[PDB]
Write a structure and sequence with these properties.
The protein is an all-alpha fold. Helices cover 49% and strands 3% of the residues. Bound molecules: calcium ion. Its EC number is 3.2.1.4.
Length: 433
């Protein structure tokens, strides 16, 4: 009852601090985390340190990491007031920059981009503190011979969105972000292909369903960041060519459909895009399967992540003047469910009876020199460190849930899980809720 969205927003930022890879800053707030993955590098030894660990593991999966950055930047642009009111503007910007500083390093050549550091199996076979890793961490890339329109496109979108975020605060960085964004889009558009067909290790973790939506997504963001009509023309041309108006709605690391539509609706003010957004939202509120307690049930994987993403699309739709009151209200019910209106909180470190055993390695570990290994994973006790701000997978279609570390469905946590969620919190704060 009566949730402090400002504090939840601050908590979400703490989750991102807990996901930081590389050398941590002197002002780090989640201090149980230590410098790690300091040897991450490319084929020629290029520095690839930094970025975010994806979930409860230590692999740096570029596709969802870029998506996370784009959505976080998006919320900072449209609902900056929310961050400011929560006294978290600086931290919000730092969260975006932690990702973009890494994308810049990963962009080793104009048409070359590293999309992963660490191998799924080698990484997942280990359970412990990231600073204790001793296994090889291979880096995989996409290039003109092994394209990745989806990966390069999303990264371009994130860089372009970030360039807007930093336009005034750091003009030099903003310009740099944009240069990289422009080059990555050209690479993505001129060399068509799914990144997971090149970086095959990712096909079993973050396989891309289609790269066409990312191309439109990227062009749209570049137009917003440059005001260069060429990008708008390309965005709309591809939107029509690919027939996105007929694609299944939704917004998540894999599909940008609803994001593209609500974004283009804002940039062009065209009714057609607004119609598509309305039909999608009305469908969710009135028809999409929901749990008995009101939670949108879009899929078993990252259930809350899907509901929060939907909530964010609704908040963006409200900004277009589409049923603002009802759309904002429904979005709030989804966020409020995650915060505890379903009976318990599903945000670690927050509210009533929150999850205490997230499927997360670093938070499960006691401090050094005590050993952290699979026996720690096997502990009946709650994770040693509270993972403040992490949104877990959530309850089942019947609002049932059991806090279980081995349950990588209900207790999974990930950077993409908190993206739409965090931006939605920023919006609620901005709206004065
Ligand atoms: Ca896609």
């Amino acid at each position: 009852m009566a949730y402090d969205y400002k504090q939840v927003l601050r908590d979400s930022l703490l989750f991102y601090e807990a996901q930081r890879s590389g050398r941590l800053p002197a002002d780090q707030k989640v201090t149980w985390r230590k410098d790690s993955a300091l040897n991450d590098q490319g084929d020629q030894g290029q520095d690839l340190t930094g970025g975010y660990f994806d979930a409860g593991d230590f692999v740096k999966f570029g596709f969802p990491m870029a998506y996370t950055a784009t959505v976080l930047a998006w919320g900072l642009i449209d609902f900056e007031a929310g961050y400011s009111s929560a006294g978290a503007l600086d931290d919000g910007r730092k969260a975006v920059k932690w990702a973009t500083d890494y994308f810049i390093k990963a962009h080793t050549s104009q048409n070359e981009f590293y999309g992963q550091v660490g191998q799924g199996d080698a990484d997942h076979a280990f359970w412990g503190r990231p600073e204790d890793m001793t296994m090889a961490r291979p880096a995989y890339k996409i290039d003109t011979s092994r394209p990745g329109s989806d990966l390069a496109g999303e990264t371009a979108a994130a860089l372009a969105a970030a360039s807007i975020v930093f336009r005034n605060v750091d003009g030099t960085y903003s310009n740099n972000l944009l240069t990289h964004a422009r080059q990555l889009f050209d690479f993505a558009n001129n060399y068509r292909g799914k990144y997971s067909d090149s970086i095959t290790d990712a096909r079993n973790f973050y396989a891309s369903a289609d790269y066409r939506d990312e191309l439109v997504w990227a062009a749209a963001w570049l137009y917003r960041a440059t005001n260069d009509n060429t990008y708008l023309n390309t965005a709309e041309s591809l939107y029509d060519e690919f027939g996105l108006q007929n694609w299944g709605g939704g917004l998540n690391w894999d599909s940008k459909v609803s994001g593209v539509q609500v974004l283009l609706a804002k940039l062009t003010n065209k009714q057609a895009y607004k119609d598509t957004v309305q039909s999608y939202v009305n469908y969710l509120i009135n028809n999409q399967q929901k749990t008995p307690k009101g939670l949108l049930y879009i899929d078993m994987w990252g259930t809350l992540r899907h509901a929060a993403n939907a909530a964010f699309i609704m908040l963006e739709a409200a900004e277009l003047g589409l049923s603002a009151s009802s759309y904002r209200q429904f979005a709030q019910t989804q966020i409020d469910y995650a915060l505890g209106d379903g009976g318990r909180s599903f945000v670690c470190g927050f509210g009533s009876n929150p999850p205490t055993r997230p499927h997360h390695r670093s938070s499960s570990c006691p401090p050094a020199p005590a050993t952290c290994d699979w026996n720690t994973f096997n502990s009946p006790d709650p994770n040693y460190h509270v993972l403040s701000g992490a949104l877990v997978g959530g309850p089942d279609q019947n609002d049932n849930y059991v806090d279980d570390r081995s349950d990588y469905v209900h207790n999974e946590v990930a950077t993409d899980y908190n993206a739409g969620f965090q931006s939605a919190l920023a919006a609620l704060v901005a709206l004065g809720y």
